């Protein structure tokens, strides 16, 4: 049948196929050769020669060049594709390449090929980065996301190349190389090697500035998808060259030995527009790799100047506004009989103030905040809590009930809860007050589940083990209900109470033999507190308590921009130069930096002798 | 040799079995684990378990889970055909089978709980589930509380102890109601211990979280 | 000995004061809430509800946190409820406070040992 | 390495004791394939495994399916 030409394709044998090729021609006397397909994919003999990679192939693909040429069957030969789910338009080309062939891949390009074909396949567009292979739907990006660097080359060389082509998820060369770069111990440098290289041979800035269907740029791009290592070359990537230093992003200003003056561009990282790098990398809660990825210098600095110009005093005003409305709740119920009349207003108008701030704020975010532990997002609900509860509870005293000493006293025992929030801009106490919220959320919800456990099971025994009084004695035997028990269980544990042998019980010895064996259990379990606290801290220290503050501290900066209008946002960068570049430069920051062991002849710095 | 090394403990060389991979003729019938295809990174890889799957006596999976003579079942049960094949029996059906008991077993012991601090000193159905799961457990447990070998209890930790305490648990539960109908008193002194140890026994089932 | 005697020093001008802020916090929060959580006596009984001034409720609930006096339900108040909610949530963040000063031990001690 | 390591082989173990107490009829869900085309003899079952990797680069010519698709 037609499958004589598959096996034959296969096994690499030229002259059995070259046997029968000769006659298939004639054998349909002219056309459509539904021989050399298939109703299930879609194959060709061409493309099926090149999956199979037999070490005598190029005989095989040089007899197929004259078969098709001497049909005039190219146009459906050449370039084909496959109709059934997740393959769509996988030409040769896109195979050639990807079986690490470069000769064959020449010869095809030499005939012409397709060069710009769109893989448009639901393999090569996978739900997420494990289920498939998305390298960009093009056989240029598919030698770039590999490690073929000279296919490549002979690619961008060709006329018909197209560089800036889009691909159909609206990604680009660049997006797709940075959709890729998985890490470093896992892949290596060469994704950052094939960047530099494409956007070298490009030349021109519309590659990075090309916007993705998702409204993206590949800085943006490897900003949300956490590649750090992209990130850090492209917020650092200086070019020495002539008409190729446009592409550059740090400029050396000057540099006299050790010290030297870096210009960085912040031109998009900057929170000047909206979906900003700075923006987009504190702002995403989905990547854990924000803990190395914000290190950055043009992200660090900027996040250093900005405390210490606007966020330090809008932080200490906000603590010290928030300490007043919090003494001043205190002692409005405390010294309240059972002028300073201005103490019941600071307290109303204020949690109005709170209720509509975060009363907005609780749910315009996505719900990927809560998925994490810490995103900010708990204290949210803690704030907004305590400002309901006051304003609740003013309401129900001033109309028709007496609850104001129910649901206010939590006001200030939740108020003064919230004074440990504000220890944020302290380095050690903020460094104190992040394991408190860990600790609480990993480890001591862990015991209290199996300490109610053990609570619920020992409370209904001890409490049907006693003997039920006649009402002799009213309070009889302190263990009469399981609320009773397990409040005197509790006390025992915590070492206040008593262990009394005569509890007027049928079984006094089984209740003592019950009460033992709690204590036991309960002092296991206390022993795993420490042992679960061994399990988690040890491994990742100085890494899990400083490093996720700094990303809280980074997100309170970008917080404090949003609480300021337009005419206070006159702290932007410096420079505009407009002079580094042919183009309108927008902003620039220095950075200096000094080093002792590189030595080296700077030819390449901006203005001529130093100062700042 | 596949058993002999599944039960020997012979990591690297089971590991070398069961992905055996050969691409010469002739010989490719030896191999086990076959390529299905390959797309740069990815690759589909055709293991073959016929005689690893625990669909015939003393397969590779039985032998490499149930022998506690061997310390190396640590890094042993890591292997592909075995890591993935126990993932998809847990996604499978194993879920269902632990769910649905952990959920018996807690309306059995809150049944027990509510059944003997309520009780005097309708709602008269609470006397029976505790009984018949009882005798159940008595059964179930009770067959194959002996059908193990004696290297169970050599080890530390051989789910063998559990075995005990469910034990004792259903013993103290029925020789309680034994106690309470026919001549004893002593209805709140073994059963008691009931819900002492079976709400210890909830404990147990926290093995299908991780954390 | 002179080696037993640096951390003494040191774990204090670093540590204790940590939790010695978090701690007064809390101490002056509960305080104030369980002064006023009590009903107000009118005097039938003198010594009225252990908790009457601020002073005493901090001094109550620093002896309940060293495991030295009373946890009695009924201490002449309004709400019974709540002040048992307040006092059980005092001493589960008392206990996870002090848990932290291990876990500080931990992070101060380990790296710089001898 | 000592606190989930066994507990994964507590919960291999319970997933094996699990197959026990299914009757015939319930293990019906066994693995895929049924090919009899990888070798010439009658082959039982297979199992498939997906592995990305970014570091080797080879032509592969030894795969069993011409082109990929699961
Ligand atoms: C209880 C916890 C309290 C936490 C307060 C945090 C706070 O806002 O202080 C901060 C702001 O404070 C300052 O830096 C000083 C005041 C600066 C603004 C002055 C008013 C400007 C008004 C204009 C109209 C302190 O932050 P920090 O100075 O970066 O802290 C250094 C860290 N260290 C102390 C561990 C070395
Ligand atoms: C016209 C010009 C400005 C008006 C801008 C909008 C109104 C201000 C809203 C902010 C506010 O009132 O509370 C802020 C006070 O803010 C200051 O202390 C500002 C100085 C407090 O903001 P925060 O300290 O960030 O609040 C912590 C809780 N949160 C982070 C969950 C929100
Ligand atoms: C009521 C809890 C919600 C607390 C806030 C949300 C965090 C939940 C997850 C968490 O870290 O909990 C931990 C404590 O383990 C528990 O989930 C609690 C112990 C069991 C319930 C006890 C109830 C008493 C479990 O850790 P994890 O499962 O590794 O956490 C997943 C991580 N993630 C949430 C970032 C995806
Ligand atoms: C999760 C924990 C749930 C705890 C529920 C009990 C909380 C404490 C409580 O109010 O107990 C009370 C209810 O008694 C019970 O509800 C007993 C429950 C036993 C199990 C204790 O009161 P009691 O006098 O034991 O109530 C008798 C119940 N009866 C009137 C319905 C017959
Ligand atoms: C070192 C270790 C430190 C701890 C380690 C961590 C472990 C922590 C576990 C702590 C568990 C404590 C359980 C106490 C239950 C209790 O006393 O019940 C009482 C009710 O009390 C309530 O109504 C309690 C309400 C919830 C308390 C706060 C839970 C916070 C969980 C987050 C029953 O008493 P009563 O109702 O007064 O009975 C008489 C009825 N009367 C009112 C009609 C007269
Ligand atoms: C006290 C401790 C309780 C422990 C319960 C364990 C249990 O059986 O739950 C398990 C089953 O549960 C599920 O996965 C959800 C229900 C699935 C079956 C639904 C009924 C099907 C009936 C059909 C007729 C949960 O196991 P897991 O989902 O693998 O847990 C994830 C681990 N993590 C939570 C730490 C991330
Ligand atoms: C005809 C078709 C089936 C009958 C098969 C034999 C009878 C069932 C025996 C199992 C049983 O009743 O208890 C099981 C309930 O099982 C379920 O929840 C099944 C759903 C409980 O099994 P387990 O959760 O493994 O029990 C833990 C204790 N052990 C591991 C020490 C045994
Ligand atoms: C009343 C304190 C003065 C004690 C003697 C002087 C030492 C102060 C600094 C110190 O080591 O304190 C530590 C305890 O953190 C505190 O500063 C205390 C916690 C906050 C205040 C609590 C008050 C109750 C903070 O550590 P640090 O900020 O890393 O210390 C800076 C180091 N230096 C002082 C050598 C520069
Ligand atoms: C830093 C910590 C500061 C603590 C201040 C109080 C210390 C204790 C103390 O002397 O309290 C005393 C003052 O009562 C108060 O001063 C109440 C303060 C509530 C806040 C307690 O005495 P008193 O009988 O509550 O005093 C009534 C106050 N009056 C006469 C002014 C109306
Ligand atoms: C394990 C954990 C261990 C600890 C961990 C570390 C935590 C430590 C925190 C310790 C805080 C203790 C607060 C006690 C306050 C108190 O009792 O107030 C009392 C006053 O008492 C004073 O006047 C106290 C003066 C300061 C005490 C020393 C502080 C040292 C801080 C360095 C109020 O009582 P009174 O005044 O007698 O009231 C009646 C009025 N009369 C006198 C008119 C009759
Ligand atoms: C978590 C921190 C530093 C403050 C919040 C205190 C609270 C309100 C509940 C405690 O976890
Ligand atoms: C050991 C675990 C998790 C549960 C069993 C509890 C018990 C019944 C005695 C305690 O060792």
């Known amino acids: 049948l037609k499958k004589r030409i598959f096996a034959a394709v296969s096994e690499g044998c030229v002259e059995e196929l070259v046997e029968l090729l000769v006659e298939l021609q004639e054998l349909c006397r002219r056309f459509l050769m539904h021989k050399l397909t298939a109703s299930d994919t879609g194959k060709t003999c061409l493309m099926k020669a090149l999956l199979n990679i037999n070490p005598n192939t190029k005989e095989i693909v040089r007899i197929l060049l004259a ?24 030409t040769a080309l896109n195979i050639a390449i990807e079986r690490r062939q470069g000769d064959i891949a020449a010869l095809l390009i030499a005939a012409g090929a397709d060069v710009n074909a769109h893989a448009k396949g639901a393999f090569f567009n996978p739900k997420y980065q494990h289920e498939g292979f998305y390298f960009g739907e093009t056989p240029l990006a598919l030698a770039a996301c590999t490690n073929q660097p000279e296919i490549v080359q002979l690619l961008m060389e060709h006329e018909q190349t197209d560089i800036t082509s889009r691909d159909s998820r609206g ?10 770069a998985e890490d470093f111990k896992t892949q290596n440098d060469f994704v950052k090697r094939m960047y530099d290289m494409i956007l070298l041979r490009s030349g021109n800035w519309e590659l990075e500035t090309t916007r993705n269907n998702d409204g993206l740029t590949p800085l943006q791009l490897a900003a949300k998808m956490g590649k750090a290592e992209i990130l850090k070359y492209i917020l650092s990537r200086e070019i020495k060259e002539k008409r190729l230093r446009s592409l550059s992003r740090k400029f050396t200003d000057w540099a006299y030995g050790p010290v030297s ?16 790098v700075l923006e987009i990398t504190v702002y995403n809660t989905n990547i854990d790799n924000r803990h190395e990825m914000l290190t950055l210098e043009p992200l660090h600095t900027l996040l250093h100047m900005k405390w210490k110009k606007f966020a330090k005093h809008m932080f200490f005003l906000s603590f010290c506004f928030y300490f ?145 009084c006649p009402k002799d004695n009213k309070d009889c035997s302190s263990y009469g209900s399981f609320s009773d028990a397990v409040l005197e269980l509790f006390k025992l ?22 009460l033992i064996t709690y204590v036991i259990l309960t002092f296991v379990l206390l022993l795993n507190m420490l042992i679960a606290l061994m399990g988690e801290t040890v491994e990742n220290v100085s890494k899990e308590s400083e490093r996720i503050w700094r990303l809280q501290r980074a997100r309170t900066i970008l917080e404090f921009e949003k609480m300021l209008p337009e005419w206070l946002r006159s702290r932007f960068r410096m420079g505009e130069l407009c002079k580094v570049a042919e183009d309108d430069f927008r902003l620039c920051l220095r950075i200096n930096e000094v080093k002792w062991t590189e030595w080296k002849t700077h030819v390449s710095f901006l203005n001529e002798d130093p100062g700042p």
């Open 261 to 276: 003056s870096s210009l960085y561009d912040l031109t998009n990282v900057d929170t000047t527009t909206d979906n900003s």
């Open 67 to 90: 078969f098709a040429e001497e049909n005039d069957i190219l146009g459906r030969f050449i370039n084909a594709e496959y109709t059934e789910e997740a393959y769509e338009g996988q």
């Open 324 to 468: 007043f409305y919090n003494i001043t709740l205190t002692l409005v119920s405390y010294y309240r009989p059972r002028l300073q009349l201005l103490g019941r207003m600071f307290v109303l108008i204020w949690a109005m103030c709170i209720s509509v701030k975060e009363g907005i704020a609780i749910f315009l975010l996505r719900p990927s905040d809560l998925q994490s532990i810490l995103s900010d997002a708990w204290f949210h609900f803690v704030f907004f809590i305590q400002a309901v509860l006051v304003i609740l509870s003013v309401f129900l005293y001033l109309f028709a009930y007496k609850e104001y000493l129910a649901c206010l006293v939590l006001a200030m025992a939740l108020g003064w809860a919230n004074m440990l929030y504000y220890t944020r801009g302290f380095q050690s106490m903020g460094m104190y007050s992040v394991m408190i919220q860990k600790v609480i959320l990993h480890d001591v919800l862990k015991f209290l589940f199996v300490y109610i456990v053990f609570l619920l099971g020992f409370g209904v025994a001890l409490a049907s083990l006693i003997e039920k």
């Open 171 to 180: 990604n680009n060369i660049l997006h797709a190389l940075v959709t890729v």
């Open 493 to 514: 544990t915590i070492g206040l109470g008593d262990l009394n042998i005569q509890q007027n019980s049928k079984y006094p010895i089984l209740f003592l033999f019950l």
